[PDB]
From a paper:
Oncogenic fusions of the RET kinase gene are present in 1‒2% of LADCs5,6, and are the subject of intense investigation. Here we report the first case of a secondary RET mutation associated with resistance to the RET TKI vandetanib. The serine 904 residue is located in between two autophosphorylation tyrosines Y900 and Y905 within the canonical activation loop (AL) of RET kinase; however, it is not conserved among kinases. The present study identified a secondary S904F mutation conferring resistance to vandetanib in a metastatic LADC harboring a CCDC6-RET fusion that initially exhibited a response to treatment but later progressed.
To explore the impact of S904F on the overall RET conformation, the crystal structure of auto-phosphorylated RET kinase domain was determined at 2.3 Å and refined to a working R-value of 19.8% (R-free 23.7%), with good model geometry. Residues 820–825 are ordered first time compared with previously published RET kinase domain structures. The nucleotide pocket is occupied by an adenosine moiety. Only small differences in side chain positioning are observed close to the F904 residue. F904 side chain makes Van der Waals contacts with V906, I927 and the aliphatic portion of E902, thereby defining a small hydrophobic core absent from wild type RET. This may tether the activation loop more tightly in both non-phospho- and phospho-RET forms, enhancing the basal level of RET activity. The results showed that the S904F mutant had a higher affinity for ATP (Km[ATP]), resulting in an increased catalytic efficiency (kcat/Km[ATP]). An even more dramatic difference was observed for the S904F mutant, which showed accelerated and enhanced autophosphorylation kinetics compared with those of the wild-type protein. To validate the results of the cell-based assay, an in vitro kinase assay was performed using purified RET kinase polypeptides, which showed that the IC50 of vandetanib was higher in the S904F mutant (908.5 nM) than in the wild-type kinase (67.82 nM). The co-crystal structure of RET kinase in complex with vandetanib indicates that the mutated residue (F904) does not directly interfere with vandetanib binding because of its location.
Author numbering: 700 to 825, 841 to 1010
Write the structure that this text describes.
Amino acid sequence: GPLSLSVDAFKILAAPKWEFPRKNLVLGKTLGEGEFGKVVKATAFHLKGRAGYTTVAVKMLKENASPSELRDLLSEFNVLKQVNHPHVIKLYGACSQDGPLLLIVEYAKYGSLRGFLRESRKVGPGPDERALTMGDLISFAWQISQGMQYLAEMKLVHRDLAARNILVAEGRKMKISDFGLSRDVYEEDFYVKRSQGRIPVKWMAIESLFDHIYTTQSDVWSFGVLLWEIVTLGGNPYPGIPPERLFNLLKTGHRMERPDNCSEEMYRLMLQCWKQEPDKRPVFADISKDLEKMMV
Ligand SMILES: Nc1ncnc2c1ncn2[C@@H]1O[C@H](CO)[C@@H](O)[C@H]1O
């Protein structure tokens, strides 16, 4: 099948620019389990010319992986070789032979954006008094917008943009991650999937949910939901609404209401990302500019 060809090709290939000796990698605690597999903290000796040990993260298959999970791992590997941007998680290498496949990536010290925002709720007296300033939250959104503009410029649809898939690294810098589901879109400008997708329902654009069409403009939809997560410090979208109810809810034009601690200007941006007609939504270059207007 397609996967056996991919596995067979990937094994035959050498790729010295990315192979890393397994003996030079030491794995540590688990940082979390996502889709495709788990992530652990690790340290790497003599990595990409860096003398001594470097702290890294390691993406590997989970126990009892399926073909779909193995395909996502290889698909994330292949995508990460092609991208290089300050707000996109960085690949350092991989371990293929004499053991299970490991992807070595930049370590993000603060973890996922969602967890970082939820943890910030515990700082201070209570919900009516936050520890992150609105200006800090806008900066995060802007940083992510810049990374998406870059990914769109090279014809990649991320498909899975959400706070759980954004990493916060040294200096509170945003790093887009979780590229297992992203798809190259150079030829046609869209990606279509016949099967039911594995993106959470509550982040999917209405044309991806009904018609299975993914484009840069459905990425903008998800970015609109991401803005909602950020502004709510990691809230859960469409609270109390079962995912199965979203089909009818979105079809009839309903959208999430303006949340607490959200300016009217920021809400106008959210709603524009959720327009039913994809071409009526802004492009990421315009989202960046609109976020800049909110900066002081
Ligand atoms: N480079 C990384 N650095 C730190 N934590 C990560 C990294 N990649 C994934 N994770 C963690 O694993 C999960 C995403 O796979 C999240 O819980 C996140 O905290």
